Write a protein that binds this ligand. Structure first.
Ligand SMILES: O=C(O)c1cccc(O)c1O
Length: 518
């Protein structure tokens, strides 16, 4: 079985007990991403799935192009369970390449547009990817081979390097299909096999690989569809990066596909462009982050377009100020829907029948009744209305990043809960309220220190069992160390140990404290 090899390659699977419950309860279903697409072509063949400028794909056309492009990848040497990096802006051909890979059982590795070669190089190595597919909005951008020529080290195993330039027609975007006869392409992947790798939030360093299976990702999409209220008449505007988990599935373009609705792709966030598309296509839903909502609400063009069709606006990132939330609701005359989610798994939505106050003040309810949210104090669970470290496990939450055993020992609890790094509380209605991050960045005399970084090194000290690197005002760096009982755990020795390891001088603790617990 593929899972046997995957485990040896760094995949941490769902424990057998928890996997059975998720089967028994009807969470995990038996469709891969491509079996889902086939059944969507069966139900919604002639419905428009995607629009981008003057290009458009019905569900039938999406499935046909995907078959064709999958046949081409197969002829080029891509094999089932191979990892392939996919970097792309918001162009319509990205849906052909995603499902083309799914059609032969290849495994996408989703990379944000705007990630540099520095990010691509480490992701390619860590995933052992054999391919890099890069889509370009124009003939000016860097091709897949241009990016690979920037690597510091050769990567011989990443031998497939293909670029697609998005042009005025789909047929002209995929000229390599011209000499390929479409194939009955048959992958043997099961729904519980790994479907793809996502990337974690890359604000503090190199992104981590996140393995999702078909069954658990499609389950999350099914649930998101219900809570966002999507139907086959839904028209959704896509302004966020297509490669990002939010835009993909919360409820994302996959949620719209799932119901036979229409996705409208814009390469741009510019207010006037988006307002025009909303008016033109009578868009009813859009997902935003606060920075885009601020841009829209302060545009003086707001009054020049008919935005009457807007019904719901998702806002994700868990960093939405109540004042802006209320401005969103009243200015756009929509139901606000806050989304607190993460590529690693758990997603929380406010509900469409929620009071406006709840949508203003909270990030709503977990997708699954089998989702488990622990607000941890020392590790112990806290009651309602107590602020603590948000931890989670459930039917679509990863049990480990891919091919990262040392990080995994730290990013998950002993009983297998994912540690989000966020703090917050569950209120009286069981709505999550995110109030901040567990360990923010320290401002030590100009330098910005990532606590997680200093913690990793200090954990390489033999007698150390736990450390928490915090900042004090003056800002100084303090390390709270829990010993395994060692007088050699002291400031001078820890500092010299870190210097010897060649960390940045400006990231060494200025103070130590050896306690028995936090
Ligand atoms: O990564 C995120 O911030 C995010 C936000 C909302 C919904 C999601 O699925 C996410 O991954």
């Amino acid at each position: 079985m593929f899972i046997e090899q995957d485990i040896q390659l760094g995949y941490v699977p769902f424990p057998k007990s928890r996997a059975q419950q998720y089967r028994d309860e009807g969470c995990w279903k038996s469709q891969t991403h491509f079996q889902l697409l086939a059944s969507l072509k069966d139900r919604f063949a002639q419905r428009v799935a995607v629009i981008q400028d003057d290009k458009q794909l019905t569900y039938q056309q999406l499935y046909d192009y995907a078959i064709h492009y999958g046949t081409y990848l197969k002829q080029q040497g891509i094999r089932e369970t191979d990892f392939v990096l996919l970097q792309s802006p918001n162009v319509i051909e990205v849906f052909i390449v995603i499902f083309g890979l799914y059609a032969i059982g290849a495994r996408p590795v989703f990379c944000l547009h705007g990630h540099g070669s520095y990010e691509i190089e480490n992701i390619a190595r860590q995933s052992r990817a054999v391919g890099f597919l890069k889509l370009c909005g124009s003939a000016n951008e860097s091709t897949a081979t241009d990016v690979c020529e920037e690597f510091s080290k050769p990567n011989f195993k990443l031998w497939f390097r293909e670029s697609i330039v998005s042009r005025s027609s789909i047929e002209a975007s995929l000229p390599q299909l011209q000499g390929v006869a479409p194939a009955n392409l048959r992958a043997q992947s099961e729904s519980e096999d790994i479907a793809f790798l996502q990337l974690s939030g890359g604000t503090t360093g190199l992104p981590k690989l996140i393995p999702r299976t078909h069954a658990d990702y499609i389950y999350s999409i099914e649930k998101s569809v219900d809570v966002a209220g999507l139907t086959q008449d839904t028209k959704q505007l896509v302004v966020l990066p297509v490669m990002h988990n939010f835009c993909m599935s919360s409820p994302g373009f996959l949620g719209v596909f799932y119901v036979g609705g229409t996705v409208v792709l814009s390469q741009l966030t510019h207010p006037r462009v988006c307002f025009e598309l909303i008016e033109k296509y009578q868009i009813q839903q859009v997902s935003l982050v606060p920075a885009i909502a601020t841009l829209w609400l302060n545009a003086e063009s707001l009054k020049d377009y008919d935005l009457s069709s807007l019904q719901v606006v998702q806002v994700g990132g868990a960093k939405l100020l109540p004042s802006l939330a209320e401005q969103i609701i009243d200015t756009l005359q929509v139901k606000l829907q806050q989304v607190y989610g993460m590529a690693e798994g758990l997603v929380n939505f406010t509900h469409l029948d929620d009071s406006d106050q709840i949508t203003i003040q909270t990030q709503g309810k977990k997708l699954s009744h089998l989702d488990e949210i622990r607000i941890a104090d020392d590790g112990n669970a806290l009651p309602i209305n107590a602020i603590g470290h948000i931890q989670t496990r459930g039917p679509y939450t990863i049990n480990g990043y891919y091919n990262l055993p040392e990080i995994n020992q730290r990013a998950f609890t002993q009983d297998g809960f994912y540690k989000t790094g966020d703090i917050g509380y569950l209120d009286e209605n069981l709505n999550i309220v995110v109030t901040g991050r567990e360990k923010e960045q320290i401002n030590r005399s100009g330098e910005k220190i990532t606590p997680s970084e200093i913690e990793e090194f200090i954990l390489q000290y033999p007698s150390v069992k736990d450390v928490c690197v915090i900042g004090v005002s003056d800002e100084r760096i303090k390390a709270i160390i829990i010993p395994k009982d060692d007088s050699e755990i002291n400031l001078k020795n820890i500092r010299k140990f870190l210097i010897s390891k060649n960390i940045a001088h400006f990231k060494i603790p200025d103070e130590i404290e050896v306690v028995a617990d936090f």
